[PDB]
Write a protein that binds this ligand. Structure first.
Ligand SMILES: Nc1ncnc2c1ncn2[C@@H]1O[C@H](COP(=O)(O)OP(=O)(O)OP(=O)(O)O)[C@@H](O)[C@H]1O
Ligand SMILES: Nc1ncnc2c1ncn2[C@@H]1O[C@H](COP(=O)(O)OP(=O)(O)O)[C@@H](O)[C@H]1O
Ligand SMILES: Nc1ncnc2c1ncn2[C@@H]1O[C@H](COP(=O)(O)OP(=O)(O)O)[C@@H](O)[C@H]1O
Lengths: 370, 370, 369
């Protein structure tokens, strides 16, 4: 009946309500070609979208519409929604209701503009905007627990206890997968593997997904890298060329735990989660320590849950029992939560309608959200 | 051992050398290795079979030229060793490498492997007592006398913009492109194929550089110059035949502001200057706009600075006092700063000694530069 | 409804006919026959008076459409297959002659490499067009031609003609009317084309290396055959000479350039994602490619250059396949333009019309604004 559409900054995920996993999965990209006066043969698309842009990557200027969970170009975001509904899902938006997701502490105008596009342009019967962390917690099954959500757009934390979100203890963070990908691309240039153009941005992203892992101890990993060359793995590109890097596997995702490398002057993901828990009430800290949930693609590095356990225990008192909930399906946890929320019978009375939107306007969504 | 140190200003297009505490570099010549195309039948001919400096400039037609450096990064190391040997030899400097310390120059964000291999050459093949590698932006500010300001530069290899404020070089605010004088010469050659006057050989490529240096001007409005019909001005070759240049003279340097005509995605000179100022902190932006310094040979086009102002006025915030300063000696600005840096008493502390290199190795060179 | 005209101009030959027909109707050479003239003048020339070129193009078009097409092009569209990097001066002159003098309904100045790609029916390909004047490379990826990745040495038909003229003059053996070498200073171009078509045997890679070794401090000299000529002056042309003339096309040393190296330089310039599809689809077209036993010598030379250390660090292991076209190697560019014009009355709309030319000024070349 209802459609769930997790508009992620990287991978735009979408499908149906009451499902195990999403059908439509693709990178939210809109590649426009090299505009030269020379002609093109047997016709082509003026602006590609999704997997088509990824396939024909070499030529196209890959521009993401969402930057840090914030929609910059709205015409680009409108084309991706259109690509999700008609091409991938093969179903009109007028029949099915549409669950959407944004990160917490976003601009207030973005929900209003997102909702305006759904009702005016797409003619949706009913829509809703949920917090990503709230859905990630709902996919995991627990009512209680903090959610250290981390995608390519935005890392953020939302502490919740017994089905009561703590909006003032929320802490949004500028560090994310895209900033890690840019950092890996820079340190690759330092060892003679220069990647400037946006076509190579996806190759270094794919290198980041495969090889990189979180260090248990950074100074120890740096010492072993200088001594031995067993850690130095090789990755072959789409092209037959193959490259080898030693230091850059553990050093790339260390930027999460040490933002000083990127030049952000912010708290690391390990202590940002701690600072979120300390901002909550003193009586409900034990359960937040016990249920330290992870979600998103930036939590898919091997050994990240072990590093979070080391750092949070180091920050917190010795008496506390720290525990990180790190499921196998944490990459697609936000969408799974939306599918379970859409499947419930209580959610049928929580939708916005066309008549309610015509009466109120875009400002009705802020009341419905939280 | 504290003799008068040598300042070798590197560069892909041109290489310059001399001594510390001088006004202008006495020894300037283009950075390439000329090798003969034809057979040398007659006795008493040009001996050696490896031509560097004024001999290679004199005998263009015989020699197949090839540049060892590309985008501020040496490809052919044996050629650069021969050029450095020619600099030190009796044909140019008339001094030994054993006596004097060395001041080398490199572009920012280059491969570290090339910097290590550069140091290996200077320490082992030549027997240098002390070596120091430095940035181009820091040297330009030494030559002007300022501490604050952005340094936009445009040589033959690299175009980069490093913002510095009262002796504080910002590493994360650095922008870099592979669009420069060599590429501008390559597209002028491409455009002269469309005019009719085709060029192919590497000696014949230097005619295109000579046309670029002499007869090129940057239009303020490129759309207005296109709608109008050009006058088709003339130019005499070293051979004798006249060449109607036409619209290729104004469309060639447009590259630097519009790299979409390439078919390879780049920021451009005007965006890099704005982006470097934008990426720095909020309070530093207005001081960085007021102190903009130009350098390199590809800033010497007619109406370049007038266009570079107009692009800043378009992009930058309104009602801000822009000031693109530029010295009289723009090509030699980097060498003058090195000679000033070498003459200062602090220079002894900054360098890498031969003994320190033998003990530590590459790690000590990476620590001293930053 | 209306089958469009197809033209493919050039310095040596000119492929022309109807759109839709598999291959052209005729191919008259580029030169023209004038009354009261010693030698025939070439039509396609660069860097020369505007009004003279205009008259030369009118004269060539007039002798063309009566003999070739048998119709007025005033009824239907035209496809002028200009090679990319054909001078804008020459295009403007072509545009003037087609609209001002004749008054055609529409024209098109589309590139040769993209149309040659339409014949294969694949969207991505590395393409090489070895014509008369130049041997131009241009890779296409998914329709769009990648422009800054390119190359064109002055090493086509005209370079082979000049080498034949040099080597025959050095070692000459003419009959009486025996001895008597270097009697005539020069020889005509039409005869020298017929010698290249018939005599010139293209060598293998191992034979080519042996010839290069012999030139700088002799193996496999045969075979040799004489060539007949008018006015009772047969010349006994040798077998080692014609092989040496073919060898300069693949000569690497001291330029770092050749027909084979030009593809590798074009591949070097191209991006990383584009790289492998261009290597897989390497198309060879043009006039010089019609020579007997050419495609092996190229593919073997390409592979030898990839084995060299300088190209291993970028290219490495690559499956260099040469997907050949339906029509002959010279006439691939024309067949593509015939496919482009015949089928699509829709894609005729994107091209420049007579209504657009008068008010505006000119057909838009790949330039600013
Ligand atoms: N196996 C992996 N290891 C490390 N990082 C990964 C891995 N897979 C994906 N990523 C990173 O995470 C991103 C995947 O996005 P994700 O599935 O988290 O949704 P999203 O688009 O970030 O939306 P949201 O912000 O709602 O999570 C990629 O852009 C990539 O940079
Ligand atoms: N007057 C000029 N106008 C335009 N371009 C010039 C002029 N003088 C030099 N150039 C170009 O700029 C280059 C010189 O810049 P330079 O900073 O020395 O580069 P590098 O430091 O990389 O050698 C030359 O290679 C030349 O192509
Ligand atoms: N059947 C053939 N066999 C061998 N060589 C040929 C044949 N036809 C043409 N050529 C050669 O190819 C050249 C023609 O090149 P062409 O494709 O017409 O270039 P362009 O189209 O740029 O003028 C001539 O120099 C000629 O010697």
């Amino acid at each position: 009946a209802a459609l769930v559409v997790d508009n992620g900054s990287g991978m735009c995920k979408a499908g149906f309500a009451g499902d195990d996993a999403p059908r439509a999965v693709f990178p939210s990209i809109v590649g426009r070609p090299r505009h030269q006066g020379v002609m093109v043969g047997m016709g082509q698309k003026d602006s590609y979208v999704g997997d088509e842009a990824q396939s024909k990557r070499g030529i196209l200027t890959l521009k993401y519409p969402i930057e840090h969970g914030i929609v910059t170009n709205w015409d680009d975001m409108e084309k991706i929604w259109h690509h999700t509904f008609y091409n991938e899902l093969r179903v009109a938006p007028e029949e099915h209701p549409v669950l959407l997701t944004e990160a917490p502490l976003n601009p207030k105008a973005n929900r209003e503009k997102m909702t305006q596009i759904m009702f005016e342009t797409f003619n949706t019967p009913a829509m809703y905007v949920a917090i990503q962390a709230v859905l990630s917690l709902y996919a995991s099954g627990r009512t209680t627990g903090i959610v250290m959500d981390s995608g390519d757009g935005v890392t953020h934390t939302v502490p919740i206890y017994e089905g009561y979100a703590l909006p003032h203890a929320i802490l949004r963070l500028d560090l994310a997968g895209r900033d890690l990908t840019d950092y890996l691309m820079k340190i690759l240039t330092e060892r003679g593997y220069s990647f400037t153009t946006t076509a190579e941005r996806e190759i270094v992203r794919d290198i980041k997904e495969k090889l990189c892992y979180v260090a248990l101890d950074f100074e120890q990993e740096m010492a072993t890298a200088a001594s031995s060359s067993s850690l130095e793995k090789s990755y072959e590109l789409p092209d037959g060329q193959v490259i080898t890097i030693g230091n850059e596997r553990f050093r790339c995702p260390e930027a999460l735990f040490q933002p000083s490398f990127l030049g952000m002057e912010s708290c690391g993901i390990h202590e940002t989660t701690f600072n979120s828990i300390m901002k909550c009430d003193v009586d409900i800290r034990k359960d937040l320590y016990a249920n330290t949930v992870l979600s998103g693609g930036t939590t898919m590095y091997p050994g990240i849950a072990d590093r979070m356990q080391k750092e949070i225990t180091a920050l917190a008192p010795s008496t506390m029992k720290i525990k990180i909930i790190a499921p196998p399906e944490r990459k697609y946890s936000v969408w799974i939560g939306g599918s379970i929320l859409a499947s419930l019978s209580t959610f049928q009375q929580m939708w916005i309608s066309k008549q309610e939107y015509d009466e109120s306007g875009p400002s009705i969504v802020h009341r419905k959200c939280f | 051992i504290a003799n008068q140190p040598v300042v070798i200003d590197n560069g892909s297009g041109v290489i310059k050398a001399g001594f510390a505490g001088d006004q202008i570099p006495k020894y300037c010549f283009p950075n390439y290795v000329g090798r003969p195309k034809h057979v040398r039948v007659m006795a008493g001919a040009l001996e050696g079979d490896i031509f560097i400096g004024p001999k290679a400039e004199e005998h263009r037609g015989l020699l197949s030229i090839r540049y060892p450096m590309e985008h501020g990064i040496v490809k052919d190391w044996n050629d650069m060793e021969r050029i450095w040997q020619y600099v030190y030899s009796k044909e140019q400097l008339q001094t030994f490498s054993e006596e004097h310390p060395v001041l080398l120059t490199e572009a920012p964000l280059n491969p570290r492997k090339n910097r290590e291999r550069a140091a290996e050459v200077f320490f082992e093949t030549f027997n240098v007592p002390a070596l120091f590698i430095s940035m181009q932006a820091v040297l330009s500010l030494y030559a002007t006398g300022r501490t604050t300001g952005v340094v936009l530069d445009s040589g033959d290899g690299v175009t980069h913009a490093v913002p510095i404020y009262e002796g504080f070089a910002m590493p994360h605010s650095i922008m870099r492109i592979d669009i420069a004088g060599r590429d501008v010469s390559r597209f002028l050659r491409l455009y002269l194929r469309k005019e009719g006057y085709d060029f192919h050989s590497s000696s014949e490529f230097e005619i295109v550089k000579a046309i670029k240096e002499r007869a090129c001007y940057l239009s303020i409005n490129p759309q207005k110059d296109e709608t109008l019909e050009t006058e088709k001005a003339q130019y005499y070759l070293p051979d004798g035949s006249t060449i109607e240049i036409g619209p290729s003279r104004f469309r060639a340097p447009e590259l630097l502001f519009r790299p979409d005509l390439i078919g390879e995605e780049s920021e451009g000179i005007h965006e890099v200057l704005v982006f470097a100022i934008q990426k720095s902190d909020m309070d530093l932006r207005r001081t960085l706009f007021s102190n903009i310094v130009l350098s390199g040979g590809s800033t010497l086009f007619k109406g370049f600075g007038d266009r570079l102002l107009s692009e800043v006025k378009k992009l930058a915030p309104k009602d801000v006092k822009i000031r693109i300063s530029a010295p009289q000696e723009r090509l030699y600005s980097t060498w003058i700063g090195g000679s000033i840096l070498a003459s200062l008493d602090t220079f002894k502390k900054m360098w890498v000694s031969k003994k320190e290199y033998e003990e530590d190795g590459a790690r000590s060179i990476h620590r001293k530069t930053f | 409804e209306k089958t469009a005209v197809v033209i493919d101009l050039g310095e040596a030959f000119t492929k022309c006919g109807f759109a839709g027909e598999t291959g052209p109707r005729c191919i008259i050479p580029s030169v023209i026959k004038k009354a009261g003239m010693p030698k025939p003048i070439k039509v396609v020339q660069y860097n020369i008076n505007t009004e003279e070129l205009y008259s030369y193009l009118k004269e060539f078009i007039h002798i063309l459409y009566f003999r070739h097409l048998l119709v007025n092009p005033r009824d239907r569209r035209v496809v002028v297959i200009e090679s990319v990097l054909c001078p804008s001066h020459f295009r403007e002159t072509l545009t003037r002659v087609l609209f001002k003098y004749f008054e055609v309904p529409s024209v098109l100045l589309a590139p040769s490499h993209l149309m040659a790609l339409l014949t294969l029916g694949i969207n991505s390909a590395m393409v090489l067009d070895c014509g008369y004047r130049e041997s131009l490379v241009l890779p296409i990826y998914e329709g769009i031609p990648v422009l800054n990745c390119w190359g064109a040495l002055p090493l086509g038909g005209k370079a082979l003609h000049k080498e034949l003229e040099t080597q025959l003059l050095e070692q000459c053996t003419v009959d009486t009317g025996q001895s008597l070498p270097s009697v005539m200073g020069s020889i005509p171009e039409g005869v020298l084309e017929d010698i290249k078509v018939r005599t010139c045997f293209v060598s293998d890679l191992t034979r080519g290396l042996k010839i290069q070794a012999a030139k700088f401090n002799r193996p496999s000299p045969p075979p040799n055959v004489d060539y007949p000529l008018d006015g009772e002056k047969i010349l006994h042309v040798l077998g080692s000479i014609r092989d040496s003339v073919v060898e300069i096309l693949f000569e690497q040393d001291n330029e770092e350039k050749s027909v084979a190296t030009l593809i590798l330089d074009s591949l070097m310039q191209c991006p990383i994602d584009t790289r492998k599809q261009l290597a897989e689809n390497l198309v060879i077209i043009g006039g010089t490619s019609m020579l007997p036993g050419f495609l092996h010598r190229l593919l073997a030379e390409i592979r030898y250059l990839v084995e060299k250390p300088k190209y291993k660090k970028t290219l490495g292991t690559k499956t260099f396949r040469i997907h050949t076209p339906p029509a002959k190697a010279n006439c691939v560019a024309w067949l593509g333009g015939a496919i482009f014009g015949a089928l699509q009355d829709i894609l005729g709309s994107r091209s420049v019309s007579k209504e657009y030319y008068n008010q505006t000024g000119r057909i838009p070349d790949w330039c600013s604004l």
